[PDB]
Ligand binder design. Structure first.
Ligand SMILES: *NC1(P(=O)(O)O)Cc2ccccc2C1
Ligand SMILES: *NC1(P(=O)(O)O)Cc2ccccc2C1
Ligand SMILES: *NC1(P(=O)(O)O)Cc2ccccc2C1
Lengths: 514, 513, 513
């Protein structure tokens, strides 16, 4: 059948991505259902008492000084969704749009938003269906715009996306997925729109992709060592112990595991060798590898530690109440007005992860550059070609493509530093977290393409170095090359690799080498 | 003068205390023992003629050229020489000393083989009032700056006195009562193959950010007192709903700053029940603009970034960043790897620099709001005194704050610019030193923006509450009174450049307590 | 010394000659007269009580506050005061003087109403050996730096001698035999409301780039003599097929540099007819790598950017950047607009900065190639002398070059960071001063990278052709001989940091002719 995620209070990143990718269905736990019914009742009382509350008895933003009569709240909230729907640009992908819906659902499930059962049910139904709302990616300063578009979609007034990205009109979407049109009550409108759900959704998909790409970065660094007689002593646990960064220790341990059983790497600690007068002279190779192999634990480790920080922060943000105003479950006050919708946390962690991704992509790019250079690849053909040299150039075109992809990645910097006072100075500081998360996603996509090129290069390199039988290659390495060859043939003669690179990249983002 | 006893671990505060000369440093007996044991180990490795980088080989891509024992002295002397190609302004006194301290801590772990004499030279330097004069540019992340540090310690390089005044090598050794560095075995490589420069710069950045963070909070609090800010946005209940540690802490500290204040608005708006007669347009909205209302969230994100930066730096400061390294357990004679790769400090420095720029942005917008007569709720335009028009108050200073911020924004992360070098041997580099230095420049600009905000607020508080600061919180009163001891009110237009610079220097070293 | 007579137009070389103290400046009779005429118009505007900014109104958004003529002196006295909120390192001697010159040229157009006395103070400064000490940061693009300039000229600010050593105001006036600035009517606003600081910085950048460009060409040519470079890639025929002026110029200068060389390859390969016996693998490819073959194109694109930069700068330098302005024809009493908006210098400075980073990158790769034993065609690894391994030669310097380039890349354009300020009155700003200063920083880094390449090439030339430079072109020999006058060959490893810095300073000021 299909796994089920029961949402109560906390959901971890793997559970969240499982639901967003449709791998698992979602159910609201009884305790959560009750907490929300209780909040629903609080919203009702707040409204009946005509309390001064943003979005219920006031205008929006700087127009909040304009009080609104209870008789016009329906209209007020209907216009809210309308004026906010000014987004433009390509729609968020299927998994990401759903991740956004999930993020808003989790914030609501904490029982402090006042959302009605129907509204909550509409979000759950969407997540359990095979559809995703079609929402424009640009327009917010960090996530009213994208969420307002989500609301319109859920009302059948906006397009839906199937798993392939094909769009369905509103009516067709509600029909096909057996979704009931969203019926907004009280502040459901503001509740569904005033949070950091878009950026959080984008970031959770980024987190999941990075985990897989990191596994490939490790698996490919290990295979590279098997193709260039790399020295395993640089990956010794003793070294990690002396510089105890969790990410480094992990990276080194994972690298060692990958080459376990290999007869292609060099396992001798050089210091064990005692020299005598006759040894003094120039040797063919230095006693240590170049940095793209020797410093892999330190570089990959720094990236893993950045991702770990990103995920710790994202875990808190995913399970937090990012809404304004909020209705305290204890009933201490009718409501609280603040800025829990300010996505500065995801903005800063997305920018940090973006930098780390660019650094790791640079490592793979240099690994490709070394492997394909006949002057540096220790005996392998230039650009790993097969057939007559000159007539055949092998991966020479692909090597340049890898460099081009990295160069483009570097052209874009952090999004967070560009805050600009807007909304008539009411929003004098903004996070741009959604932009930050999206820019990070783009870099992750380029990294997958660079790793894809490296993977194809290594499959060819392994066969050139060890024969089609991959003699001496570690079990893990053999399995990885064999799996690649199931879909990607050896480069016996020059051929267009563009489509294959793109195809492989798509795979890398969703599955790890095991 | 307090003393920091170095055994295995030292925290960031103890580190800065030694680097800033606030405390002496002593090597604990256990550390001396571990180091002597490592020295004995290196001696054995050399006697056994083990194939070890720097002891029996050339450097970098030239490591394939094996060297005979009789030539190792020359080898290591030349190492210091060819690596001394740095250029640029020297690191400041505190930072250069922090760099020396960082190398000492790495050595004290007992896996470098440094001689007692070399260790003592590092300790002596830190207990003196001097710092080596080392150029700030040249490394890809820290051979260059460390090589210069060695030359200085041999009396072949300049020193810096606390004031930054330079002394020649001979004068430095004499005045600081330092013995010339006498390198043995691989001391040269040990003193040079680590991340000590970027670590030293980063720990100074860490300390400065803690103080500036306290100022950011104290000034946001005073801003609320000058603009009738609403404290409900800083309630603890909101923090609990979105439990980011930095956010909870910022909110709590903000509340503490305005405790006892009669100038802030404490009413929860939702308590008010509306009547039909109330429907219409009211004078002010029920919530504040973001520069006040979202301070917990913005400041908090910055605080969580600094917390991450500090966790990573603490590990780096206390790690052995050297190559090769000699295992204390004696499992193998030596290990060759890449613990000198400063990718961790590079990434955290880049992330912290972004956070600093974001927080400087908040303070810049706070100045912009406070000085705008259309937004400061009744305060004079640009907080001037005397006749308007004839006097413009802080109008110039406000533009200066915007200029400082715009400059910070022009510089991005250093880490993304790795370039293959050293004949492709160093095909990937961290650029951590550059990253930390760029972060330091942003921190300096942030202090200047905060200084401008502080001077504006002292004037605003008096304009709003009178010279007696009636209704101002005890913390707010204490802060203003403290500033006024050295910075007079602006009763008439005057040059503020020098005052802004003087205050910024203070903000970087002390918090409002 | 030589004298530049200012009438209406002054070119960039004439401007830098005055700024650098190489030439004196004199106001031509026609300029004196059109200025006296403007001074008369200012007096008339004031006598008639015309509604004019700075004469009868407040500043910025306070301009809506009309002022009585009985308080205009106070108004302008306070203007200089509140604007003096600058911070940061002072502009260097030559740049600060270039700034004074740019303001003088703007005034010479006769549309500012500046008095003869004020004009005389600016001319006296330029004819002295001094420069005002002005903070580099504070403006959004140049009220702040200019206000500090005024204070310096009134003797209420520091002065700088050619060495950068500071003198107090009183001493500056005394030593320079200057009279204290005595402001009248709107001299204050006239001396402060323009783009003079960024223009001054940019003109110094233009001059420096011309020299570095010449060194970039001279070193690329010498590189070809050290690596058996092919001159057919620099043929005029190729330039004609892709007629970019800069490319045609770069190729022509490159051909001129290697004229007479017996070390470069001059055979067009296509002339060779192949036969069955030739099919096979040859030692080297028939074309060079891009750092040699594509030099005309890379250097040429940089030269075309500089050309654009200088065209725009020439117009800016000779334009009137002030507000308000008093039309020389008398069509109206005064005009109010925004000719102080330095968007032109901002954009060209940013474009030039990018070009400089690109060319510095070329020089960095040329060093990488020259020092790599796998790519330098037989030269020693890192061009060392003595035993290999024991000696590492330029290995440290090569990494330093990479570090310098990486740092240049971390900083981007300044223009894209406009932020609304001055109570939204200045809702868009150019940041031209920041753009020009960032460009200057990159130019300094480029000079250091070129200095490293020059020292590497001097060594490589001798290693390849012997101490007598046999076969080296006359130009190449002259260049190496000139370098060796002050920089000895690297017979053994030594610290190069000081030499790199010294040479960089020279490269920025003189070309290899
Ligand atoms: N983010 C809000 P706030 O909760 O009032 O700060 C500002 C805004 C502007 C338009 C529509 C909704 C909101 C919510
Ligand atoms: N970082 C080193 P490694 O320890 O050999 O990797 C590379 C290098 C280059 C010149 C001088 C010293 C070193 C140490
Ligand atoms: N640039 C000016 P404008 O000529 O009024 O546009 C704005 C400003 C602000 C403070 C002091 C002088 C000026 C001139």
């Amino acid at each position: 059948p299909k796994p089920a995620v029961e949402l109560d209070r906390h959901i971890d990143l793997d559970q969240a991505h499982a639901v967003a990718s449709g791998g698992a269905r979602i159910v609201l736990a009884p305790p959560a259902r009750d907490r929300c019914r209780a909040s629903e009742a609080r919203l009702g009382a707040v409204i009946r008492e005509a309390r001064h509350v943003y979005g219920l008895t006031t205008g929006f933003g700087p127009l909040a000084n304009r009080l609104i009569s209870g008789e016009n709240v329906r209209t007020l909230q209907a216009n809210l969704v309308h004026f906010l729907a000014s987004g433009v640009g390509p729609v968020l992908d299927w998994t990401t749009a759903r991740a956004m819906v999930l993020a808003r659902l989790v914030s609501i499930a904490q029982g402090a938003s006042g959302a009605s059962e129907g509204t909550i049910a509409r979000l759950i139904d969407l997540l359990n269906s095979e559809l995703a709302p079609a929402v424009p990616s640009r327009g917010t300063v960090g996530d009213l715009t994208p969420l307002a578009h989500m609301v319109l979609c859920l009302q059948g007034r906006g397009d839906f996306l199937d798993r392939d990205g094909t769009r369905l009109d509103g009516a067709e979407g509600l029909r096909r997925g057996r979704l009931q049109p969203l019926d907004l009550s009280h502040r459901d409108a503001l509740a569904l729109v005033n949070g950091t759900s878009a950026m959080t959704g984008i970031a959770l998909v980024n987190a999941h992709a990075c985990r897989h790409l990191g596994n490939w970065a490790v698996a490919l660094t290990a295979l590279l060592a098997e193709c260039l007689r790399g020295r395993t002593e640089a990956w010794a646990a003793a070294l990690s112990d002396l510089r105890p960064h969790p990410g480094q220790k992990d990276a080194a341990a994972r690298l060692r595991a990958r080459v376990d059983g290999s007869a292609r790497v060099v396992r001798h600690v050089i210091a064990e060798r005692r020299l005598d007068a006759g040894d003094i002279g120039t040797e063919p190779e230095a006693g240590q590898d170049a940095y793209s192999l020797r410093c892999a634990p330190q570089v990959l480790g720094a990236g893993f530690d950045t991702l770990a920080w990103h995920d710790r922060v994202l875990t808190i943000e995913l399970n937090a109440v990012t809404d304004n105003p909020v209705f305290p479950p204890d009933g201490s006050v009718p409501a609280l007005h603040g800025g829990n919708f300010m996505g500065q946390h995801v903005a800063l962690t997305s920018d940090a992860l973006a930098t780390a991704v660019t650094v790791l992509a640079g490592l793979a790019e240099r690994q490709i550059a070394r492997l394909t250079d006949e002057r540096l690849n220790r005996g392998l053909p230039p650009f790993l070609h097969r057939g007559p040299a000159g007539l055949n150039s092998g991966f020479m075109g692909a090597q340049v493509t890898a460099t081009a992809l990295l160069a483009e990645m570097r052209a874009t910097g952090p999004a967070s530093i560009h805050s600009i006072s807007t909304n008539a100075a009411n929003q004098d500081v903004v996070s741009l977290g959604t932009i930050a998360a999206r820019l990070c996603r783009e870099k992750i996509d380029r990294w997958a393409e660079i790793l894809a090129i490296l993977a194809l290069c290594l499959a060819q390199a392994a066969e050139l170095r060890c024969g089609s039988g991959l003699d001496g290659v570690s079990p893990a390495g053999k399995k990885l090359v064999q799996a690649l060859r199931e879909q990607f043939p050896p480069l016996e003669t020059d051929r267009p690799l563009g489509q294959e690179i793109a195809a492989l990249a798509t795979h890398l983002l969703q599955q790890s080498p095991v």
